[PDB]
Amino acid sequence: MVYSVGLTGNIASGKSTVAEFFSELGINVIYADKIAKELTSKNTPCYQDIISHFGSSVVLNNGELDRKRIRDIIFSNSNERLWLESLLHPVIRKKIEEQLIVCTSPYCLIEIPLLFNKHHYPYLQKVLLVIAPLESQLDRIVKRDHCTKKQALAILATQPNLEQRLEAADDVLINESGLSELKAKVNKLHQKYLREAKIKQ
């Protein structure tokens, strides 16, 4: 398969911006969260499996899934979390693999959503973890959800501690400056992945 780099972190740390910067370098970026959404869109097969399991309470006026409600449920309920992971992991993985087959770039970037499950992604050559200072994260969450700083802090409080992620990452992008420097760092990582992809089989 193609040389694959896993992009991890939370969106409040600038993960989406980093992904876009890789795209700006001509790298195919596979968004696993987008895939998860597309696979659970209105009147899809998995969408019907989910409603059949969770019932009508996770259905909005739209007919669309109440994703916030589902996330809240599986966070506190491990049985439901494992059920949903068992449903979607196989289908998500097949969709990623399809994109990798038709990958046109020298290597591929795979944006893994914030709940990283490394076991379900054996095919990665590298893991890139994006982190940012706490204050920046709060600021970003505040603007994106118009909530309060205290609420933003609570939202962050329920996120996985970075110790394991930090150990399980081959590279850590500390997003603690502006966008020019962030882009500069992505460019350096880009050169690195090109070099490693060239000499490793």
Swiss-Prot record:
InterPro entries: Depp_CoAkinase, P-loop_NTPase. Its EC number is 2.7.1.24. ATP binds at residues 12-17. Pathway: Cofactor biosynthesis; coenzyme A biosynthesis; CoA from (R)-pantothenate: step 5/5. It catalyses: 3'-dephospho-CoA + ATP = ADP + CoA + H(+). It is found in: Cytoplasm. One of its GO terms (biological process) is coenzyme A biosynthetic process. The keyword Metal-binding does not apply. It holds the Pfam family CoaE. Residues 4-201 form the DPCK domain. Keywords: ATP-binding, Coenzyme A biosynthesis, Cytoplasm, Kinase, Nucleotide-binding, Transferase. GO terms for cellular component: cytoplasm. One of its GO terms (molecular function) is ATP binding. It is an enzyme of class 2 (transferase). Belongs to the CoaE family. NCBIfam families: dephospho-CoA kinase. PANTHER family: BIFUNCTIONAL COENZYME A SYNTHASE-RELATED, DEPHOSPHO-COA KINASE-RELATED. Catalyzes the phosphorylation of the 3'-hydroxyl group of dephosphocoenzyme A to form coenzyme A. This is Dephospho-CoA kinase. It comes from Legionella pneumophila subsp. pneumophila (strain Philadelphia 1 / ATCC 33152 / DSM 7513).
